[PDB]
Design a protein around this ligand. Sequence first.
Ligand SMILES: Nc1ncnc2c1ncn2[C@@H]1O[C@@H]2COP(=O)(O)O[C@H]3[C@@H](O)[C@H](n4cnc5c(N)ncnc54)O[C@@H]3COP(=O)(O)O[C@H]2[C@H]1O
Ligand SMILES: Nc1ncnc2c1ncn2[C@@H]1O[C@H](COP(=O)(O)OP(=O)(O)NP(=O)(O)O)[C@@H](O)[C@H]1O
Ligand SMILES: Nc1ncnc2c1ncn2[C@@H]1O[C@H](COP(=O)(O)OP(=O)(O)NP(=O)(O)O)[C@@H](O)[C@H]1O
Lengths: 382, 382, 526, 272
Amino acid sequence: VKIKIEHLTKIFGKRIKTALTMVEKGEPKNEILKKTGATVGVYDTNFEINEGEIFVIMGLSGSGKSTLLRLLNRLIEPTSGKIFIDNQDVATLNKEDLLQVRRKTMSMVFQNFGLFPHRTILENTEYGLEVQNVPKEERRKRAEKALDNANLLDFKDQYPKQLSGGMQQRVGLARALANDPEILLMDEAFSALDPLIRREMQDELLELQAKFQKTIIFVSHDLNEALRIGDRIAIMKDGKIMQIGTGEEILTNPANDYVKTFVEDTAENIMIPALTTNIDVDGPSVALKKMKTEEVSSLMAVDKKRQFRGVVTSEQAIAARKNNQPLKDVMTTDVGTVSKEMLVRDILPIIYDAPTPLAVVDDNGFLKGVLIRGSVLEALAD
Amino acid sequence: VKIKIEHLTKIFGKRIKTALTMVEKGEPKNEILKKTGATVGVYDTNFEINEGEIFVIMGLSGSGKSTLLRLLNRLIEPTSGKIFIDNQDVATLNKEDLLQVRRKTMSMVFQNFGLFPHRTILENTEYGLEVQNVPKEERRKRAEKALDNANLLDFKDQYPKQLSGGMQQRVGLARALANDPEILLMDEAFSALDPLIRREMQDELLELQAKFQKTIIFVSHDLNEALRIGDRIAIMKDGKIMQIGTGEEILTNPANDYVKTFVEDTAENIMIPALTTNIDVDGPSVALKKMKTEEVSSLMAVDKKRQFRGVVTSEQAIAARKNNQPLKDVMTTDVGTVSKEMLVRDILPIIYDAPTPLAVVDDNGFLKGVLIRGSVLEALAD
Amino acid sequence: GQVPIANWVSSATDWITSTFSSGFDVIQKSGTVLMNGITGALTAVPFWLMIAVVTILAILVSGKKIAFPLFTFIGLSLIANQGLWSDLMSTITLVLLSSLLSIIIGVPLGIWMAKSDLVAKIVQPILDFMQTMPGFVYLIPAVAFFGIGVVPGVFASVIFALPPTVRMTNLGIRQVSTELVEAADSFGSTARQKLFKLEFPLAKGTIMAGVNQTIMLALSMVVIASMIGAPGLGRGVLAAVQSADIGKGFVSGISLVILAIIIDRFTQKLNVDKKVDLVYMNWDSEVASINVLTQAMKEHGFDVKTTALDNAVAWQTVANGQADGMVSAWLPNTHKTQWQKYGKSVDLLGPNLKGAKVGFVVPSYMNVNSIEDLTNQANKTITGIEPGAGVMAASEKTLNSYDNLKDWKLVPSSSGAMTVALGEAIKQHKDIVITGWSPHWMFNKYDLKYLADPKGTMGTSENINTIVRKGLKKENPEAYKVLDKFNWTTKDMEAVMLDIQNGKTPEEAAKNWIKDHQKEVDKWFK
Amino acid sequence: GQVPIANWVSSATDWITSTFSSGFDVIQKSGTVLMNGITGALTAVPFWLMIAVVTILAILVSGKKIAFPLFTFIGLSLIANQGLWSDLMSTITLVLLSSLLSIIIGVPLGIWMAKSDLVAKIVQPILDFMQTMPGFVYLIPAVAFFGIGVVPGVFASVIFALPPTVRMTNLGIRQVSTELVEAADSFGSTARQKLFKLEFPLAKGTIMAGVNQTIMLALSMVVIASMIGAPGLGRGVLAAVQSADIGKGFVSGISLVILAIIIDRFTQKLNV
Ligand SMILES: Nc1ncnc2c1ncn2[C@@H]1O[C@@H]2COP(=O)(O)O[C@H]3[C@@H](O)[C@H](n4cnc5c(N)ncnc54)O[C@@H]3COP(=O)(O)O[C@H]2[C@H]1O
Ligand SMILES: Nc1ncnc2c1ncn2[C@@H]1O[C@H](COP(=O)(O)OP(=O)(O)NP(=O)(O)O)[C@@H](O)[C@H]1O
Ligand SMILES: Nc1ncnc2c1ncn2[C@@H]1O[C@H](COP(=O)(O)OP(=O)(O)NP(=O)(O)O)[C@@H](O)[C@H]1O
């Protein structure tokens, strides 16, 4: 165990001791607001955190989750509660000790990368030490070392504005790491990047955490972004609905009914956007390019007018290319075609024989989606 | 055929008649710049367009491709050339006739949606008619009709700022359509949306074009965004490298060598980002959630420390869930594991037996990617 | 060699004023009658009614906070308590004309600025040359064009308040995102349609900010123009300056602050017979005369208009024919160059006061008895009055007539600024030389003396006179008869001026003397 | 039912000026000697030398462009031709004293305003009450405190030019993105660290813009103060006004606008 929290809470607005007393009994937040006009972002939060335990904190815009982070670091002074780090509280600390705790243990990462545009990447990276009054060569050494750990040192002596989101995020994370912190707070760090770069950053972060065993108070509104990396989750709606974590207990034994809609636990509404190949104008090479970009091995083939026609496979396209023979001849018209919400489960047998999915073709020939062993999921939900 | 262009070109800067004369001989753009300081964005452009022929225009930032659009609509007065629409030139037109051509035939779509924030969606939608001096009930009728065609009429009497990119784009496209134009110019319309919404918009646009046979001068820097929809492509680097179009001829017989790097036509560098399941902390329900989000049927399973361990399948996870038995027991350790650039093609046989891919596991147990019938592509490139 | 810039400018202005004179005069008539009618209309409204109206509008504009309406009501009540209402209404009418004209002439100019790239290049230089130019200049040609009154205030405020409106308009129309303009073009929106549908409804914020700046500038420039016509609180603050009267200057400044805050706060919350026309010059000597003259002259049934301004302007005012007359013409030497310019364009009456003694002034305790017996006392300074005064013609010639003064400096001030500086010297008990004249009031409180002038250039046979425009005898004989007889005692005039300096109002002290000497006063009325 | 504002203000002014008289007198002596020395220094320099130096500075700050330095040389030559050089130097020294005093006492006040919301509430009203009063008033107490000369001119210019400096300082320190502020406070950076590493270098544009405004206001207030001591071209323009001699008035206004243009251009090129 590393952290331990007790009745931590934060009240905004004015005339708040009344609100503090109220939460000391258990009045809901909405009553407090309507009575005092003192909006509350956190409410009787109690939990604990261990070492190396990426502890995600999910929720919606308005749950007061980033506020919880900033309370851990005390950027926002807690209205009440305690935070036992290193057997040392944090809400009862003088300024200098809190300052050293910030410089040494904690470190922060932000949604929009929290970077100084009036500096070059290395200065931003070393700022955490620059403010600690240390000689400059070791500062620059650790900065270049961290950047080399992120494969962008050649991109130093440049300015953030001339970079892309991913490199700015890597720079912010390195600035955080330069300190050798025992903790890393994030406020939707990867939420501003592209989802591809988002996955890349998640994988890199997991790699790091495997190498570096340090706590991480992540924050995200994407449940995917939490299950991928999160070792213990905590969902927040103005308070801790449940944080049993371990990934499934949010899915297996959700205490509330709100979580079960937050994670979103019949008919063929499970169809997914399809990968299409308009044969009449495109051909084999285009189809193979589409497969490469789309990271698949087969495709669905339609008529120019968006009528479904059949299926295409990588080998079929290759044969077409070598033979110069075009599509609509080396093609798979025979397919287990399906309707929109009309073959829910009678399809169980047919889905097994055919490795390819079963396009949910509209009765008029149009196509909406496909089905790839997502049917086995809710066929057995019974 | 609808459009026909002749030696159209546009010269910026000053002292340009010299530049016009130069392009009349064939001097490169860079020489013109260094000699006169008159940067050129278009250079001796000649082509033609047909009806219903989505005519994409690819290129890089600096190719002067959006300038070509704005020249078609004459928002930027052409330095020279002609544009024969409806057997009527466009660069030799008085103001009123050009104005009517803009109101009736042409219509425009922009990257950042070109929406007036000081109006409500319906007013933006009807602006194209509002400026034509028509009575208001038919204006509102056509506006609501178009919005209903985009499934957001309930979102009228609201402001764009309180919407998301997709709905703003639909509104802009409807504003364009309200006019019943015979043409639709776009400047990287979908480039500001999410790629998911981008694909949805592409499919909707193709649906529309099937229903509505009207020309579309699309623009995009994504080759995917062109092959998906484009019926005839034209690549641009300060000039028309080649526009044979038809999708493959850019891929099959690329006249230049630049195109072959623009479209990007050995070792296992074809590996793709993998879909992972950290068994030691996550379990069956989490794995099935990942499959659902990731739109697949199987997954790769690793050790907490990012060592590869094996494979998991939807049925295996379902059995684990019903039986309550966890992963690392109902799992597929046996797999055709592979190294990073060391089994390029000897793997041809093994890839066939196994429906699942072959993880390119680092020799130390780490994982980088997988291989899904992308090997059949360049195994036969020989 | 030097270039005749001054001669060129004066020649061009003279050619204009001789060429477009009829247009200037008709504009003067129409504008003055218009502003006078508006002011009469506004002051016809009782103070309680308009104060309550404005507080109600404050409530309507903001109903949650009670700060602005409260400040408005309290301040306007305070003003009307101090007696500064009619002046306030004149100030508002000037400000409205100025702001409206500046807007009407700038916003179109901002349009023709943004829609053309040549006009920006032409005008922005002019805007920078207009936006740093001091206000004092703008009102020089105004008098040369329209002459004294409200018209100069309007013109100066226009020319001084136009720049920010024009600039912010051109900025706010040139800054709308190019996609919106490109769209409005792609849908075939004529310039008018996009201008009235896209440009303005988005630039209005910047345009209103520029209009707020225009209003501020017009207000300040009215305060400045007070020296010429420009009635209102500007006259009050100006007189408080030229007399060092801290209280009245503070009062007028606070009233202008109230007016300006009111207008500002509103703006940011609307973004989303027998008549006499006399002239005097704020000199404690001449304040006593006219004020007494008017209060008495009223009794016979004379309609009065006193206009406070500088000496040489008044001579021009009386000269060209823009006013009736004035009784503040020290002569034949202190204001002689004024006569050399516009002494020929009058019909002088005759003295009004015998014994106008001019000369330097020093504390009696100091040794020096004549200017020739002065070595290097008082840092070789001559603490004088406004540089446009008449004694400065003498003092300029004095320092350039004697040897010992060849290395002494003349430092202008106001006609009352030195008096407080003097009082500082006597309390500090330090040598100090000050330009001076008589009759005056400080002689009655301090122990001071003149300095004998062996050359006597700065004035020996000095005596106030009074002048009237030629032919006034054929256009207002009653005042011509009255003014001719206006000649009275030298000695206890000072009761008029000593009473005031002790803490009474000019009219109140001017009233008191007339009761004592009503018999002599009635002699003037004949 | 009138209320005696006049009497209260006069009594307060008399009491304050008769109470702190020694301090005002010593300040008068020091300021006048300092300003006369500065003016003698700046006018001792031959005018060709200073024109050439300043044109060199124009070329330095603007290398490719020739219009601005050409205008500088032409205007300053015109001034020196007409004889308004010593006046010009007196005006400059007044402007310098006023601007530096205003900056020195306002920028820290801007910091304090940005650091406490209470002080902003206290001051913004005072800034509104200060930038809205006409300049004419501000000097009346000046004479009452410092007397005829230049000291009152610079005091009034200070009081009339300090608002926009303070306002822009507070506004430009209060508008920095709270993300960077949270980054600074999260890596353990005291107020000094972030103030001298984060707040300033990002507020500098606003601060120097406000300090251009301050200079314009001080210059105008000097022109006004010319009615009391306050030498320079203000005296020339005032004499033109009091005589309607449009010649000298326009000449001095041309010279002042030339100076203001020079200063605006220079200040515009210390922030970019
Ligand atoms: N990037 C990745 N990382 C890790 N494992 C991956 C992976 N991509 C695919 N797999 C796994 O390997 C198998 C390869 O599928 P393939 O692409 O040959 O065959 C695919 C594809 O060719 C076709 N298909 C058509 N539209 C599709 C779509 N929208 N999404 C997925 N597959 C689609 O349907 C088949 C469904 O594949 P299924 O789920 O049976 O099985 C998939 C999946 O279990
Ligand atoms: N000024 C404030 N700053 C922070 N929280 C506030 C503030 N005022 C009120 N709050 C409370 O905190 C909540 C903020 O919710 P939160 O989930 O932190 O939103 P967010 O800032 O959009 N989150 P994130 O996207 O992760 O940065 C509000 O709903 C309030 O209950
Ligand atoms: N002001 C200008 N507007 C448009 N084109 C210009 C301009 N100035 C120069 N050009 C020329 O046109 C080119 C613009 O390239 P282009 O591919 O249109 O860029 P882009 O605007 O980033 N494209 P897009 O993202 O589709 O809107 C420049 O490289 C110049 O050759």
